[PDB]
């Protein structure tokens, strides 16, 4: 699980 | 699961 | 689990 | 678990 | 567990 | 457990 | 447990 | 346990 | 246990 | 200029 | 200029 | 200029 | 200039 | 200039 | 200038 | 100038 | 100038 | 000038 939140 | 949120 | 929050 | 919060 | 909080 | 709080 | 608080 | 508090 | 308090 | 490279 | 490199 | 490099 | 390097 | 290097 | 080096 | 070196 | 070296 | 060296 990789989560990138910008 | 890869999630990219811009 | 990698979480990046900007 | 790696968490980066900016 | 690595947590980076800026 | 490594915690960095700025 | 390493804790860095600035 | 290492704790750094600034 | 090492504690640094500034 | 927005560049997304995966 | 925003650059995202994965 | 924002640069994200993973 | 913000640079994030992982 | 903010630089984050992991 | 803020520099974080891990 | 703030420099954090781990 | 603040310098933290671990 | 604050210098912390561990």
Author numbering:
A (entry chain A), B (entry chain A), C (entry chain A), D (entry chain A), E (entry chain A), F (entry chain A), ...: 1 to 6
Anything the authors wrote about it?
However, while 45LNIYQY50 (R1), 47IYQYGG52 (R1), and 137VTQVGF142 (R5) formed unbranched and elongated amyloid-like fibrils, the 129TASNSS134 (R4-R5 loop) segment formed scarce and more amorphous structures. The 45LNIYQY50 (R1), 47IYQYGG52 (R1), and 137VTQVGF142 (R5) segments bound the amyloid indicator dye ThT and demonstrated dose-dependent amyloid fibrillation curves with short lag times. 45LNIYQY50 polymerized with the shortest lag time. 45LNIYQY50 and 47IYQYGG52, which are overlapping segments from the R1 repeat, adopted very similar structures. Both segments, as well as 137VTQVGF142 (R5), adopted a classical amyloid steric zipper architecture, with two possible dry interfaces between paired β-sheets. The β-strands were oriented parallel to each other along the β-sheets. These three structures are class 1 steric zippers, as defined by Sawaya and Eisenberg according to the organization of the β-strands and β-sheets. Specifically, the R1 45LNIYQY50 and 47IYQYGG52 segments and the R5 137VTQVGF142 segment formed fibrils that bound the amyloid indicator dye ThT and formed canonical amyloid class 1 steric zippers. These segments contain Gln49 or Gln139 (marked in bold in 45LNIYQY50, 47IYQYGG52, and 137VTQVGF142), which are critical for fibrillation and cannot be mutated to asparagine without interfering with curli assembly. The R1 segment 45LNIYQY50 and the R5 segment 137VTQVGF142 also induced fibrillation of Aβ1–40. In agreement with the hypothesis that the steric zipper segments serve as spines of CsgA fibrils, we found that the D-peptides also inhibited the fibrillation of the R1 45LNIYQY50 and R5 137VTQVGF142 spine segments in a dose-dependent manner.
Curli proteins are produced via dedicated and tightly regulated cellular processes, and their fibrils mediate host cell adhesion and invasion, lead to immune system activation, and scaffold bacterial communities known as biofilms. The two key players in curli fibril formation are CsgA and CsgB, the major and minor curli subunits, respectively. CsgA, a 151-residue protein, consists of five imperfect sequence repeats (R1-R5), defined by regularly spaced serine (Ser), glutamine (Gln) and asparagine (Asn) residues. The first and the last repeats (R1 and R5) form amyloid fibrils in isolation and are critical to CsgA seeding and nucleation by CsgB, while the other repeats (R2-R4) contain 'gatekeeper' residues that temper the amyloidogenicity of CsgA.
